[PDB]
Design a protein around this ligand. Structure first.
Ligand SMILES: *[C@@H]1O[C@H](CO)[C@@H](O)[C@H](O)[C@H]1NC(C)=O
Ligand SMILES: *[C@@H]1O[C@H](CO)[C@@H](O)[C@H](O)[C@H]1NC(C)=O
Length: 529
């Protein structure tokens, strides 16, 4: 019972709930994003979470080793690894910024409190708030770069924190208070945020839906990607975590409670951020949509001010940034370990050379995250955030679902769940796995690909070659399935019929496929809801 609660809190609070969710909610209005989030969750997020947990807990193999039930669809095990690598590339600069802020927070007089220092412009209206000018001119030094075509050399101040983060990661890869401290910090912030004057107009703008923006596509794509980010599906960390789970563990109870608590925490985080946004908009005499830029650094401009308005701000800042640092370290470590374990288990060459491989991969991710700590590192961060997950994560999840359901059998999957746990899935889960979820994922993928929506940062407009590069990096991960499928199809001996038979039949039918027995060579298998 106690062990169950601690595991539940593990998937409840994460870096995607605290950092990404308020940013995405501010981008799309506040309620016009709340509605699609719940709609997509209760239909396509929980069924896939329960699905992935059950598949991992039954196969007891690695991220790419669970595809012995459909050999042809095995490149989706490398697509998720590439997606995890791309995400972990920019998951490090968040920790670097948190470390920089924590090191700069050890002073009785915080620097993000007035515009009188060297890095200030005569446009401050303590115009631009002091916190935003501090973040954009004394931490990033973004005003010295024209754009993504002129990045300059990396800053040594942020490199001296990236090195520490990398070393800590490697030496942790080569806790009761950890999981519960964010709850206390968030509650203590929420009390002050609600009690603050002028926050009711920041809560009303949060609990209100505009039908005009519901007829767009960007909101739906953002909600679809955010569900995957928050729940954790599509990265392969769920299968890796469930590989060493108890074989008799109940799954529906583990899938309902985690989703419920994750939704509650996301709602609370958005509530706090929008209440403080309303208070700041009231104080600075600006509209709510004007007081900040909808960029990836919203919580580094909003939360320092909230800490400042709070009595004895130094201790509160230290505690908040320690909490954020631990959250980010755990989030990066999870994906890093997932990639390491998957690549180690897939290939037999790297059996004993584990330390060398881990050191080289850590060195590679450091050398490739070095790009985001230059002058114009926010532009590269925005490109990576827009294109790393994008449509590729939805494509991978959709392919995985189509594979395990249609190619294998929802009846066979339910039979395996019956053998594993006590009960059998009802009709709702079977229908969601069979038709409802893919019919939404395919639509989301098509809509995301068709629409233009070029990336931007405030008034800046990205050029054409940046979009071409982003599409290249997205397709690089997306196109690992067809190449492996072609290689496996050409590798199998026999004729075309035999090649397809051994490519699509489960590997547990080894002694039966030879004896003229192919279950997939019919129509009754496919017409089984
Ligand atoms: C601001 O800097 C100027 C120049 O040194 C001077 O007025 C004073 O040192 C500072 N004043 C405040 C209120 O910070
Ligand atoms: C700051 O004020 C100057 C003075 O006119 C103006 O030229 C400049 O555009 C302002 N900065 C921004 C970011 O608008």
């Amino acid at each position: 019972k106690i062990d169950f609660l601690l595991s539940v809190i593990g998937f409840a609070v994460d870096l995607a709930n605290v950092w990404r969710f308020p940013y995405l909610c501010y981008k799309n209005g506040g309620g016009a994003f709340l509605v699609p989030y719940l709609l997509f969750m209760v239909i396509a997020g929980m069924p896939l979470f329960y699905m992935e947990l059950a598949l991992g807990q039954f196969n007891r193999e690695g991220a790419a080793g669970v595809w012995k039930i459909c050999p042809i669809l095995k490149g989706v095990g490398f697509t998720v690894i590439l997606i995890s690598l791309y995400v972990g590339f920019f998951y490090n600069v968040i920790i670097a910024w948190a470390l920089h802020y924590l090191f700069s927070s050890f002073t009785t007089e915080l620097p993000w409190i007035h515009c009188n220092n060297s890095w200030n412009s005569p446009n401050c209206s303590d115009g631009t708030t002091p916190a935003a000018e501090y973040f954009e001119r004394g931490v990033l030094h973004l005003h010295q770069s024209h754009g993504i075509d002129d990045l300059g050399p990396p800053r040594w101040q942020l490199t001296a924190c990236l090195v520490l983060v990398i070393v800590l990661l490697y030496f942790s890869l080569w806790v009761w208070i950890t999981a519960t401290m964010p709850y206390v910090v968030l509650t203590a912030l929420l009390l002050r945020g609600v009690t603050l004057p002028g926050a009711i107009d920041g809560i009303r703008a949060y609990l209100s839906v505009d039908f005009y923006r519901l007829c767009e596509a960007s909101v739906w794509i953002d909600a679809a990607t955010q569900v995957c980010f928050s729940l954790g599906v599509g990265f392969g960390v769920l299968i890796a975590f469930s590989s060493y789970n108890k074989f008799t563990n109940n799954c529906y109870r583990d899938a309902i409670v985690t989703t419920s608590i994750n939704s509650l925490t996301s709602f609370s985080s958005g509530f706090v951020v929008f209440s403080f946004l309303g208070y700041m908009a009231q104080k600075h005499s600006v509209p709510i949509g004007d007081v900040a830029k909808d960029g990836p650094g919203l919580i580094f401009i909003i939360y320092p001010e909230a800490i400042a308005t709070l009595p004895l701000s130094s201790a509160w800042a230290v505690v908040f940034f320690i909490m954020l640092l631990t959250l980010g370290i755990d989030s990066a470590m999870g994906g890093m370990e997932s990639v390491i374990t998957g690549l180690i288990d897939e290939f037999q060459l790297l059996h004993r050379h584990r330390e060398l491989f881990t050191l080289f991969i850590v060195l590679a991710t450091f050398l490739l995250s070095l790009f985001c700590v230059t002058n114009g590192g926010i532009y590269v961060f925005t490109l990576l955030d827009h294109f790393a997950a994008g449509t590729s994560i939805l494509f991978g999840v959709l392919i995985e679902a189509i594979g395990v359901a249609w190619f294998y059998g929802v009846g066979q999957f339910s039979d395996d769940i019956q053998q594993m746990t006590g009960q059998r899935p009802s009709l709702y889960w079977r229908l969601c796995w069979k038709l409802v979820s893919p019919c939404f994922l395919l639509f989301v993928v098509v809509v995301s690909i068709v629409t233009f929506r070029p990336p931007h940062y405030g008034a800046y407009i990205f050029p054409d070659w940046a979009n071409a590069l982003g599409w290249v990096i997205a397709t690089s991960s997306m196109a690992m399935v067809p190449i492996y499928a072609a290689y496996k199809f050409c590798s199998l001996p026999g004729s075309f019929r035999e090649k397809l038979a051994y490519a699509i039949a489960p590997e547990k039918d080894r002694e039966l496929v030879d004896r003229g027995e192919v279950r997939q060579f019919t129509l009754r298998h496919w017409l089984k809801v």
